[PDB]
Design a protein around this ligand. Structure first.
Ligand SMILES: N[C@@H](CCC(=O)N[C@@H](CS)C(=O)NCC(=O)O)C(=O)O
Ligand SMILES: N[C@@H](CCC(=O)N[C@@H](CS)C(=O)NCC(=O)O)C(=O)O
Lengths: 582, 582
């Protein structure tokens, strides 16, 4: 638990305005605690300057004690304005560190690999980033607001009560802080289980209500309304049990804490009374002792809540620092070359064996050649493993056995960014960003003006359907935009492809939908935009009645390439429409 | 804003243990504030009993001031234990009121009508119940913890400072509380906009991350990782702007508040000094005045956060009290009769005209008769409005024109609960409760033992497939259970129907799925369980090649019944398989 504190003490520095305002935060911390401890001393002086017999000098308050009254006021005001200014100044440092850490972690995540991003749910990762960065924010914020200043003030109070009254009073206030902290830590560790129980069996009741209201037709059809009401009562009853235990334990915590300070303040009042009756102290030293220890009691009023959230931050920060050290599985070879990509695009597979979970090979000892400018298609049965082809050449994965060469160069030796620039993809299903259609089309090339977007809408016939949209192509689209049809989604994908202008083109199960006439329209569309555009293109389909009129055909059975040639040579195998029995 | 306070002051009462512990809460409130204000008076006595010249009696602390030292300790301890005990005691009252209000609102919601439950999203309604009841909890909790006790203590402090020192000191502390409350209310109203901005542009960044990580294949295929990182930077930058403004405004609030008390305490210190030098007061009366006003400053330290959440509670509580006064659209006639239901089940429609949005009639001037024990089906085109039939007879809706009679009695005159008991439904799609299959089957009859569930699994062949489930029929099923097939969902529905044992049976688009062989199996299954079980049954299908062999057939064109008779008379119209062109 101290290792994380070491790391996150070390990191926030190294800018100039950052270090300037953290110096200002520390300066206001120490000045605030000094002006805080000077309040009881000026209160002692006000008491002890008016404790003269009025048969003495008397006179105006300005002459007797006006300096120390104004100094009491100024010390109180300054001691809280310094607190609020150190908070306002260190919050800038905390927030900037949070922004740069969250950005670095997000970039790391996007640089990780598909096995990782299919292992774990994305909502979990983004909540990990969010809660880990709020945890780091609370660690810096807590260490500068609560943990350090009240420890500094405990030090100064045990020092002044030593310098003026002896080690009796320092011993009492140090034993008080030891007992108060032991008690508050133990009780708030015991109490957070009640807090999380009252949160768990509140989401329980909320989702019981959600389940009953989603299934409203069902609950009404079977006439058991009272059953749902009773189940909601039982869930809410568990909630009220846990909330009552939370409030009761909070009462126990607060009462025990102030029993510890009231025992401390009473014992120091007694020893101050012994000091006064023995003649050592004065009467004002009583309010000095009492107000010093009580002023310690103001920051430590939140010891139970800046330890619960501090430990929760050290739990979430650990998950974020677990994401920050995962891996890079597919890495490029050092000093990778962008070479051999501007050639006549040929992809040759050499004895390639790849499968998900290598104990079950899906693609087995495969070798092929895809020349330049050719509309080649690959066909096969369902689940044979054709879809890995793209995921193998885009170097989303690696070939466990065998090698891949684009125009006489191994993929493991080519620079990753230029490789993935050169490739262009139309996926089987294209998810759409919850944005404007202008930006979904623009996602092919971010630094593209509007006219390129318009042309991309033209070339695959999107412009008519975006004129048909309400706001033009400024329409907000997505899962929360307008519910659209899959054919227009692949039109968006091919518009992305047109804006990329890549050498290599892939259409990986681009026709996988229900009907045929929209499919044959989009097939035609991508044909006149892909052939007569002089780029090498690889279709992928298990529906070969769609791609029977392509240029070069290859077929894969059970992980091996079997037949390679034209349509008529394929005609001895399936390729007839005979699979349309249903 | 005061009307809600009137209502929720009025309601929590009327039980005996409830009123007992609210009496105990109020007793501890007043006792706590009394023991709180006695702390500065015992501190005055400790100061003023040791301010004697030590040339006087002197002696032990026990003789001089030991009673008042122990009384200072006891008053502090008691004044905080009474606070914590009034909180622990009034929390029971608050939670029980919340449970009964949330149950009443939930029962009200389930008693509302389908137009309402299709108008509004269910998540919105359940968050309305949740947040409205947390709002009522915070209103009772806040009014007993913060708003009332600190107003009582302000009253007692302005009363004691009047009784002992004059109206000068009461005027100063009342002007202090007026200025402190005006300032804190104005600043926390100005500051909550920053708080909600920092919450809105944090969900913005979180969903930007969610959108980028869901679309991971897409962002990797177009090589624009830096684009997503930059957009996450802009969202997080807006977050850091708003969080910096939140922390800065909190610093302003806290510093201004303690400027107001420090000006108050200094001005009262000055007038106490004038009183001491004039001989009126004593030196201990200075610590009396200072500690009284400062002890007021402890509860008012949360005035900015028990007003923000109090106003948010009066916003959510209003939405809940808007749900609590909606309507009952379809109500039963007063003294409705359960009569005419145990007859030979015949349903006659008389000149019935119903449509959604009555400016567009969907069903138009319809009259038919459904005798007892007959397997009758109704067919027609897509969207003609056949599905309203069930929703018309179950009295989910009302016939705008025309009347409905089951066995010579109008539906508007029959008791609703016995009506909906007598009806049994197999919906087109049956949602399944996120529970065990044992309870989804049990939902037909809640007070059914296991053997009835087993028999219901037998009669439609569910028992084999629940033996096939991992835990037997104890398997947890649902959206988060095991992903199942639709045919087994309708098997669950008909098992529900068997456990109901109703006279009337409806199968409203029960066959609406993709394939046919599972459909023909489930059609057969429901046939041998429905006919030869001597209950009148109404199938509903727009796929009449499935129901062509039923007993009685009726057909509806464009909202009017056209032909009624056997299968051969229907054969002159469609009913051939000729619609299977695709
Ligand atoms: N002073 C108490 C808690 C003070 C406190 O927690 N105040 C705010 C948060 S700063 C609160 O309401 N927390 C909820 C809780 O602790 O139950 C302690 O020693 O733990
Ligand atoms: N004393 C400050 C607020 C003290 C406070 O509210 N602390 C905690 C626990 S109740 C909190 O909720 N802070 C949230 C905030 O106000 O930003 C005021 O007068 O508003």
């Amino acid at each position: 638990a101290i290792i994380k504190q070491m790391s996150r003490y070390l990191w926030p520095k190294d800018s100039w305005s950052d270090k300037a305002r953290v110096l200002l935060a520390l300066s206001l911390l120490v000045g605030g605690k000094v002006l805080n401890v000077h309040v009881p001393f000026y209160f002692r002086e006000i008491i002890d300057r008016l404790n003269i017999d009025v048969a003495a000098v008397g006179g105006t308050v300005s002459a007797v004690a006006g300096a120390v009254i104004f100094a009491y006021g100024a010390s109180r005001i300054g001691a809280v304005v310094s607190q609020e200014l150190r908070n306002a100044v260190f919050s800038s440092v905390a927030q900037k560190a949070i922004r740069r850490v969250a950005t670095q972690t997000f970039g790391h995540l996007l640089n990780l690999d598909l096995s990782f991003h299919l292992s774990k749910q994305t909502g979990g990762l983004t909540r990990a980033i969010d809660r880990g960065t709020k945890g780091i924010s609370y660690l810096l914020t807590s260490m500068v607001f609560h943990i350090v200043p009240t420890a500094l003030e405990i030090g100064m109070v045990c020092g002044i009560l030593t310098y003026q009254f002896g080690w009796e009073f320092a011993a009492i206030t140090a034993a008080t802080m030891a007992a108060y902290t032991a008690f508050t830590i133990t009780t708030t560790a015991w109490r957070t289980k009640f807090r999380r129980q009252a949160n768990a069996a509140d989401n329980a009741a909320s989702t019981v209500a959600v389940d009953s209201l989603i299934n409203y037709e069902a609950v009404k059809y079977f006439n058991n309304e009272a059953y749902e009401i009773a189940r909601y009562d039982k869930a809410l009853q568990a909630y009220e049990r846990s909330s009552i235990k939370v409030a009761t334990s909070l009462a126990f915590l607060n009462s025990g804490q102030n029993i510890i300070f009231s025992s401390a303040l009473t014992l120091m009042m007694w020893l101050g009374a012994r000091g006064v009756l023995a003649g050592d102290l004065s009467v004002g030293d009583l309010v000095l002792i009492n107000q010093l220890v009580f002023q310690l009691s103001v920051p430590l009023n939140f010891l139970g809540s800046v330890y619960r959230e501090l430990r929760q931050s050290l739990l979430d920060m650990e998950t974020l620092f677990d994401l920050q050290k995962v891996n890079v599985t597919i890495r490029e070879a050092p000093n990778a070359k962008p070479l051999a990509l501007p050639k006549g695009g040929e992809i040759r597979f050499e004895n390639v064996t790849f499968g998900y979970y290598p104990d079950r090979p899906i693609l087995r000892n495969l070798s092929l050649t895809i020349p330049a400018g050719k509309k080649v298609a690959v066909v096969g049965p369902s689940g044979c493993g054709k879809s890995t082809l793209l995921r193998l050449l885009f170097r989303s994965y690696d070939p466990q056995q065998g090698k891949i060469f684009i125009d006489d160069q191994d993929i493991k030796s080519v620079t990753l960014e230029s490789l993935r620039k050169s490739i262009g993809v139309v996926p089987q299903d294209t998810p759409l960003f919850n944005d404007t259609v202008e930006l979904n089309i623009r996602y092919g090339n971010v630094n593209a003006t509007q006219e390129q977007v318009i042309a991309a809408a033209q070339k695959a016939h999107i412009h008519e359907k975006i004129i048909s949209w309400p706001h033009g192509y400024q329409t907000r689209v997505g899962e929360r935009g307008l519910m659209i049809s899959g054919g227009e989604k692949q039109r968006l994908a091919v518009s992305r492809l047109i804006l990329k202008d890549p050498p290599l083109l892939f259409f990986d199960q681009a026709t996988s939908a229900l009907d045929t006439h929209t499919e044959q329209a989009l097939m035609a569309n991508i044909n006149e935009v892909v052939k007569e555009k002089k780029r090498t293109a690889l279709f992928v389909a298990h529906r070969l009645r769609t791609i029977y009129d392509a240029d070069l055909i290859i077929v894969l059975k059970e992980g091996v390439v079997v037949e390679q040639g034209s349509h008529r040579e394929l005609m001895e195998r399936d390729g007839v429409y005979a699979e349309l029995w249903m």
